[PDB]
Amino acid sequence: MREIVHIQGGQCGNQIGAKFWEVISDEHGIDPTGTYHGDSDLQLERINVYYNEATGGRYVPRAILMDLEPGTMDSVRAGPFGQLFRPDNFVFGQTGAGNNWAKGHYTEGAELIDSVLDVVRKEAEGCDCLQGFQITHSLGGGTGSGMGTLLISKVREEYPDRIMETFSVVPSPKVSDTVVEPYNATLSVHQLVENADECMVIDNEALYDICFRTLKLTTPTYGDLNHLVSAAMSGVTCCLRFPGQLNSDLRKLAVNLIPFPRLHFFMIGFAPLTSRGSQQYRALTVPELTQQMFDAKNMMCAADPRHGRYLTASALFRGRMSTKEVDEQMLNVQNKNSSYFVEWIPNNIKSSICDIPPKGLKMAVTFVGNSTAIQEMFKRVAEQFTAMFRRKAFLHWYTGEGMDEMEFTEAESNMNDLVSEYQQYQDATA
Amino acid sequence: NKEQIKQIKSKYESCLTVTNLQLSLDSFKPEAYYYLKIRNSNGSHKTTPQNGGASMMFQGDFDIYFRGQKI
Amino acid sequence: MREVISIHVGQGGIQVGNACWELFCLEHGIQPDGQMPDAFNTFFSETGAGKHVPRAVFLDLEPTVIDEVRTGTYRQLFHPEQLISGKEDAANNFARGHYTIGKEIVDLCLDRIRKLADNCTGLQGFLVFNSVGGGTGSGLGSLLLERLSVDYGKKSKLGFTIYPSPQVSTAVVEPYNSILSTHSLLEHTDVAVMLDNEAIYDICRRNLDIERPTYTNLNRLIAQVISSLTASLRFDGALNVDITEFQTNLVPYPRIHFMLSSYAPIISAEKAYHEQLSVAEITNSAFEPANMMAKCDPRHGKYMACSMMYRGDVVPKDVNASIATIKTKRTIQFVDWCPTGFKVGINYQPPTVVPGGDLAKVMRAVCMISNSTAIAEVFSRLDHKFDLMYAKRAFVHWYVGEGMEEGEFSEAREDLAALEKDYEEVGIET
Amino acid sequence: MREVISIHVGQGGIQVGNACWELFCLEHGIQPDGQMPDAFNTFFSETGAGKHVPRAVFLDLEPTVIDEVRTGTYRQLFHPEQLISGKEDAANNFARGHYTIGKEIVDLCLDRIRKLADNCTGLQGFLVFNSVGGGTGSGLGSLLLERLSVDYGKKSKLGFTIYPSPQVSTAVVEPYNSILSTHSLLEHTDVAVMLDNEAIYDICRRNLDIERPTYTNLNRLIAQVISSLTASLRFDGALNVDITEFQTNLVPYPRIHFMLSSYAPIISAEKAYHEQLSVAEITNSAFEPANMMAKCDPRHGKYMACSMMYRGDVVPKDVNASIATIKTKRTIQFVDWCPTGFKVGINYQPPTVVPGGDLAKVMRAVCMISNSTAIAEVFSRLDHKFDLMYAKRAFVHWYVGEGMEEGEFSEAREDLAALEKDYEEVGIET
Numbered sequence A: 001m002r003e004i005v006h007i008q009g010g011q012c013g014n015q016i017g018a019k020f021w022e023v024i025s026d027e028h029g030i031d032p033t034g035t036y037h038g039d040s041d042l043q044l045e046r047i048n049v050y051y052n053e054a055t056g057g058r059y060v061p062r063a064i065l066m067d068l069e070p071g072t073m074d075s076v077r078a079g080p081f082g083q084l085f086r087p088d089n090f091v092f093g094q095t096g097a098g099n100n101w102a103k104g105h106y107t108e109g110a111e112l113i114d115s116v117l118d119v120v121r122k123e124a125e126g127c128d129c130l131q132g133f134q135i136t137h138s139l140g141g142g143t144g145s146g147m148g149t150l151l152i153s154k155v156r157e158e159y160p161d162r163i164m165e166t167f168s169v170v171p172s173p174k175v176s177d178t179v180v181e182p183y184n185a186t187l188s189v190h191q192l193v194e195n196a197d198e199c200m201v202i203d204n205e206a207l208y209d210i211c212f213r214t215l216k217l218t219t220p221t222y223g224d225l226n227h228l229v230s231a232a233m234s235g236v237t238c239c240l241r242f243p244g245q246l247n248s249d250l251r252k253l254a255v256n257l258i259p260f261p262r263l264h265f266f267m268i269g270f271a272p273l274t275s276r277g278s279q280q281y282r283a284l285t286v287p288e289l290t291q292q293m294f295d296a297k298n299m300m301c302a303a304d305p306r307h308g309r310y311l312t313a314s315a316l317f318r319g320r321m322s323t324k325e326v327d328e329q330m331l332n333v334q335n336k337n338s339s340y341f342v343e344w345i346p347n348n349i350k351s352s353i354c355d356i357p358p359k360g361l362k363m364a365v366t367f368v369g370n371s372t373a374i375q376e377m378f379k380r381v382a383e384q385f386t387a388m389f390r391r392k393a394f395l396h397w398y399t400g401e402g403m404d405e406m407e408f409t410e411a412e413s414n415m416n417d418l419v420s421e422y423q424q425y426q427d428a429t430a
Numbered sequence B: 001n002k003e004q005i006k007q008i009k010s011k012y013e014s015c016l017t018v019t020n021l022q023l024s025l026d027s028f029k030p031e032a033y034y035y036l037k038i039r040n041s042n043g044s045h046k047t048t049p050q051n052g053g054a055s056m057m058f059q060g061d062f063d064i065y066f067r068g069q070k071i
Numbered sequence C, D: 001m002r003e004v005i006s007i008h009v010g011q012g013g014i015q016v017g018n019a020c021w022e023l024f025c026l027e028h029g030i031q032p033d034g035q036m037p038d039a040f041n042t043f044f045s046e047t048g049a050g051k052h053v054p055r056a057v058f059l060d061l062e063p064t065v066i067d068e069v070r071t072g073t074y075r076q077l078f079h080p081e082q083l084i085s086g087k088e089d090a091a092n093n094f095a096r097g098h099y100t101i102g103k104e105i106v107d108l109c110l111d112r113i114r115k116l117a118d119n120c121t122g123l124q125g126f127l128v129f130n131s132v133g134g135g136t137g138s139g140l141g142s143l144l145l146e147r148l149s150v151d152y153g154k155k156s157k158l159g160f161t162i163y164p165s166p167q168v169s170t171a172v173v174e175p176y177n178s179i180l181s182t183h184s185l186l187e188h189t190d191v192a193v194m195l196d197n198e199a200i201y202d203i204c205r206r207n208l209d210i211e212r213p214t215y216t217n218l219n220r221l222i223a224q225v226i227s228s229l230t231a232s233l234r235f236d237g238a239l240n241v242d243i244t245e246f247q248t249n250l251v252p253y254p255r256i257h258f259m260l261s262s263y264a265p266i267i268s269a270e271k272a273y274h275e276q277l278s279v280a281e282i283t284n285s286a287f288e289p290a291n292m293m294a295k296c297d298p299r300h301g302k303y304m305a306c307s308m309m310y311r312g313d314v315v316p317k318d319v320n321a322s323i324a325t326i327k328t329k330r331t332i333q334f335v336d337w338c339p340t341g342f343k344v345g346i347n348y349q350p351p352t353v354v355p356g357g358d359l360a361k362v363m364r365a366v367c368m369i370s371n372s373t374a375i376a377e378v379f380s381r382l383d384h385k386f387d388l389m390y391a392k393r394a395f396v397h398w399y400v401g402e403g404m405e406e407g408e409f410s411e412a413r414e415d416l417a418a419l420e421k422d423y424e425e426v427g428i429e430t
């Protein structure tokens, strides 16, 4: 019951899913052949959340994979746990977008999306009670940031009451791999605010910083960043698949973390994270988890959370632990940092406990906090956008496929209005 | 004429008809003849040569067919 | 399901095509007979049982080079009737190969192009190679580009032209046809890469330590650059780049698409292994002005956008840590309206070595394609060379008597003046 | 229980009959002696024990060719008294072979035809071969057709006439008898196929790469076309076609039954196997104007109906997918009052190869019989050639003195004018 379907688009989203599904399968004891080989009874009670049942007793994820080029899905199939995905759900084009947002949203993405919407509708109509959808995509690419966001609007138009999740990677100015990143980032943020019920920003720069400083491993690769993102993704829905002292589905988090409908851009972090050589030194206790949870360097975004004030915060503890300690520590982390918490909403931290810890760990915490410090990312994105747009650089590529500069002006104005009205509440006082 | 026009309209995106060409130069040689060569990427037309004078008037209808650049 | 077709016209084009086609056959394990004793599909096609046929066509009016090809070790590889050959050479006369003898040959080439294109299903684009300072090369390249631009339309075409050196020259009349061909491909080619011989001679002398190089050594380096550019289409990589993802990242405006390339490392086996060849040092060497593949000084102008490809065991974090260092340096400055200008690609397959060649085997390499404002100097010097002889109308009778009009020389001069004004207008800050 | 009788008259007719009768004997496994060391019944008859006798008759007034036949390796095959031979040649005079010496021979031929027909039980129709530009060929063909049209009535007769080339000619008087024979067979033959020599010479030169062809090479291609046409009667196929199923599909009106043929592929063993010979490429090659078996340009006129035969391992869906592509092309346009114009036949038996010949062994082939409006050009040029000499009454005395009336030339001219007017009247849209 109350299950969700997985939809991913683009190369970055496909690579994120290729590790997210591996993590989920390892958590539920599903072999790469789709056969259950788990140890505990609880591993099968709520498997309908992510997995479907077919004849022969094997399980198949309800994931939908879409891209405008076939290479990435032809590569993910040969990887581990690549056989679980149903071949029918693979939809792809023969041309690609070339990191051009217009091509992936107006000319090419519009004709292809009917086929993927057909299978999306097939998956949603069938399921017992829908909880919602979760979306993984990147804002630094053309086909992803175009087709995914248009699909968001199409899904929202047909299921207005369901919940919608988006895990979005925004292009940081530090590690830049594409010159046209500001254009399709700014165009995508315009559409994303209007339809997504929840959005979670993730930055490659913050992932590299975490890998270099906390884990202290010499050579980070995309596999480590994907693993961290996958652990963070799994931590959110853990209590929906396992029993606990205070169950809290996604809708309950939506109620408690979004004060106003347009303020739904969160930054997350996962604890504990320790190096291989120091994993024996540390002792896992609730104070040790909560001190690392609120650490500024532990956030999955380069945004500095002590440059603003938290509107609200959430924590999803895992493992068996006493609730009194959790509540007193949450109170203590809020009394010692009163300057960084907005004062006109008292008791702005939500907590939840799940009795099933991750495989290999005795305690774990997932942190989701809505803070005013996120304005800095939109500020720098808009700064680069307005630095590049004033000369109409690279504009002809977009304008040759039916798009105009008016949609750029409206997007810039709406993004600046969002930036302004997000900080409006930072200076608000009672 | 209809089939030729249909073949022309199938090959080209537009036509420009140029008429009444008046040449004025800062200096003419009185003993020299002048003609205009009207050209695009698809072909060229030539006027009849006329004797040099302070203004020369070349008569003719010059149909210039385009497939891209309108120069 | 992704394909590309390479066009070779003229003596220089055929001699660099031979150079790239030993390298591709060696890299995909195909013997010179065409027989193997799913990545080949980008350049080759399967015949059903046994041999592979290249997706390439060789053009020339002068039969000597084609006859040399049809008797060498590669006689069995190419299809017998795609090596189109003429009888009479254009003899460095541009008007000949554009108006007199090229027209009767161009129809067969277009028929061959159609017969090759109907086989491909996912055609990415075309590649073309031609030495600019020759009659048949420049003239037939211009005519083929003009026919293809209307037969196919929006398909992407890439041109690896070899402009004459600043002072070193083999002919005496090459500025005329160089200017005319630049006129022709200015409005007809999506990408043009600079390849003059003097810079590559200096590269060989300084790094490879060869004091008597021949054309084969130059062509092998060009072939390596081509392989590095197209590796991302036929090998798995952490950060892929497609051909269609260029005009959205390197071409700010439709007129400006001339850029100059560089490669690193270039080193011989006698002293290669004594140093570690870290990613930082190779990416520093790639940006050195003395390692430009065209004899132009980047210190004389701004950068617009840099697209640079890695291959081997490089890790993205090391790439970011090196892009930061380059942004730090005061001798390299980017244009004002471009905050980020780097597009990064990472591939896993290390560069392959050709036996008996110059380059050694290494695990890391970098190839950069950079668009800079300093390129206007070559246009200015070619224009100055052209004006000297066009003042007295020298050598014009060799062109007027081959069907070309008198005024055709002036409009190429006007287009070059327009291009030079445009390059100055773009490079000024706001 | 299905039979067909082939008639060979004249030197060209006998020389193409020899060419087809090596091929049939080779295809059915019969040795040149006539002895095998149930499909043969279409062309042959069983004698009770041992040898097979062809259902063919050879006619000529000049004895040299028949004497050559009766001494070659095939002396034992044909029945001794069906090789009817005369004593005096007509010497390119049409009036001779229609009024003077052909009448005394035609009775024996008709007796032989009756003796062959009484043996057959399921007679499909007659085949006739005759080179038009000769006296005995055209005259005896006309007389035989006129006798058969009244002796048998509704039985179908097919004529594989060889008209003279546009400019290449062997005689000087062949337009006269060509026009007269066209007059004679216009109202007497159900199907006429164009076969002029110049087009087949060009085919051999371009594809077979033979620079010095002889008549045997031409006759082998004609024999292959005949075998492809009649394969459906003696081999199992997924989509069969009978001879009687032609005037219902290719002949819109009783007057219009002249059509021109083409064949594909035509390729030598030296370069045949390097390419895959897919059905799409062969069906594209068959529609190429340069591969017409008669020197006429199909681009100058509309199509009326296309009947095209396949043989080998071709699958119907691939045929449909290729008919769609041809309907797509803008250079091939059909007449307005014909929405669908294709009749498709598929057979399983691949074409057989003759040892020492030109063509190689292939698994797929296509033969098309297409009726088009462009055929009027050959009639117009033959008419123009005729008028030039008929203005001064040249060479007429050679015809008036052989019993023909003066006015007989004019009415053939009037019938050609009527045919040309009819072809113009049909091709206009409604």
Ligand SMILES: Nc1nc2c(ncn2[C@@H]2O[C@H](COP(=O)(O)OP(=O)(O)OP(=O)(O)O)[C@@H](O)[C@H]2O)c(=O)[nH]1
Residues within 6 Å of the ligand: C009, C010, C011, C012, C013, C015, C016, C062, C089, C090, C091, C092, C093, C131, C132, C133, C134, C135, C136, C137, C138, C162, C164, C169, C170, C171, C174, C197, C215, C216, C218, C219
């Ligand atoms: N890099 C490189 N350049 C070459 C090579 N061969 C010729 N060139 C250049 O080509 C220019 C002249 O054009 P060519 O390619 O030699 O001759 P072409 O293009 O066939 O034109 P034609 O003279 O009419 O035959 C010279 O200035 C050379 O610089 C080569 O092997 N490598």
Ligand SMILES: Nc1nc2c(ncn2[C@@H]2O[C@H](COP(=O)(O)OP(=O)(O)OP(=O)(O)O)[C@@H](O)[C@H]2O)c(=O)[nH]1
Residues within 6 Å of the ligand: D009, D010, D011, D012, D013, D015, D016, D062, D089, D090, D091, D092, D093, D131, D132, D133, D134, D135, D136, D137, D138, D162, D164, D169, D170, D171, D174, D197, D215, D216, D218, D219
């Ligand atoms: N395709 C082809 N045409 C031939 C061949 N032999 C002759 N012809 C053509 O036949 C025409 C003349 O008629 P022929 O067949 O040679 O002679 P005929 O039909 O027996 O008439 P007579 O001259 O009276 O004997 C010439 O113009 C040739 O083009 C041949 O072997 N193959």
Ligand SMILES: Nc1nc2c(ncn2[C@@H]2O[C@H](COP(=O)(O)OP(=O)(O)O)[C@@H](O)[C@H]2O)c(=O)[nH]1
Residues within 6 Å of the ligand: A009, A010, A011, A012, A015, A016, A099, A138, A140, A141, A142, A143, A144, A145, A176, A177, A178, A204, A222, A223, A225, A226, C238, C239, C240
């Ligand atoms: N975490 C992670 N990020 C990736 C990976 N591959 C690419 N990216 C990011 O995705 C961005 C490029 O997105 P792109 O591949 O063009 O998206 P697309 O246009 O939808 O295919 C780069 O800036 C990378 O930082 C990966 O395997 N893992």
Ligand SMILES: [Mg+2]
Residues within 6 Å of the ligand: C010, C011, C062, C089, C136
């Ligand atoms: Mg040459």
Ligand SMILES: [Mg+2]
Residues within 6 Å of the ligand: D010, D011, D062, D089
């Ligand atoms: Mg004869």
